[PDB]
């Protein structure tokens, strides 16, 4: 199937963090302030007054080499709902910009709401905080615009040292491509993505591996 991507960072609780969301082993991590894993999975999303669970850090992109990278998306899949698609993994191939026919695998860790259409909005810090900015009252905030965040490189120099090397992959490996088009499919996840989120589903092995490289 067919499908859009955007881009972004809020650094909100992602919503396949709360259990009984989806079949799986454990819902994904949120982080305190400091980008340590917290342990209650029932924490209080930071993007609500009085919170204090935010997105983690290491649930961010990057390259394996110059055609494949990995990451994490929120998504919204037509035909499905959040208990089929929360921790599943996807391949995407990019279709259009700059970045066409390379390869993604991302994990989905949250929900989007575009009925009707396969919609990635792939993790980035800097990619834009959208309606909530969890990353305000998380460290002072990231620099950049509501929707779309920065414009250049160097402006990953001023983030926050854990959120850097996300940042960079947008312009280094994706070439800041603008909201390229893709081919997806679901995969069973790689081991590399699980580390990071700590979410399996029960259904991962019904579906095909994909082979890093
Ligand atoms: O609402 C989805 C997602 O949008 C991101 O901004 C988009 C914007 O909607 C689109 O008009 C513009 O062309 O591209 C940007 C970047 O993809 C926003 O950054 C996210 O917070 C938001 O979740």
Redesign the pocket.
């Known amino acids: 199937a067919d499908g859009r991507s ?3 960072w ?1 650094c909100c609780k992602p919503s396949c963090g709360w259990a009984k969301k989806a079949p799986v082993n454990q819902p994904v991590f949120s982080c305190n302030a400091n980008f340590q894993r917290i342990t209650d999975f029932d924490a209080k999303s930071g993007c609500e007054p009085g919170g204090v669970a935010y997105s983690c850090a290491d649930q961010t992109p990057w390259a394996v080499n110059d055609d494949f990278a990995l990451g994490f998306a ?1 998504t919204s899949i037509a035909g499905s709902n959040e208990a089929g698609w929360c921790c599943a993994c996807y391949e995407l191939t990019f279709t259009s910009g700059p970045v066409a026919g390379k390869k993604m695998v991302v994990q989905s860790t949250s929900t ?1 709401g575009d009925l009707g259409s396969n919609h990635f ?1 792939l993790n980035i810090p800097g ?4 309606i909530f900015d969890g990353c305000t009252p998380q460290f002072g905030g990231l620099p950049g615009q509501r ?3 920065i414009s250049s490189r160097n402006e990953c120099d001023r983030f926050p040292d854990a959120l850097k090397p996300g940042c960079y992959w947008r312009f280094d490996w994706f070439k800041n491509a ?2 390229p088009s893709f081919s997806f499919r679901q995969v069973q996840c790689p081991a590399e993505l699980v580390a990071r989120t700590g979410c399996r589903r029960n259904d991962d092995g019904n579906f095909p591996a994909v082979q890093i490289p």
């Open positions: 955007t881009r972004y809020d929120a989007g909005d990619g834009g905080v959208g929707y779309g965040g603008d909201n």
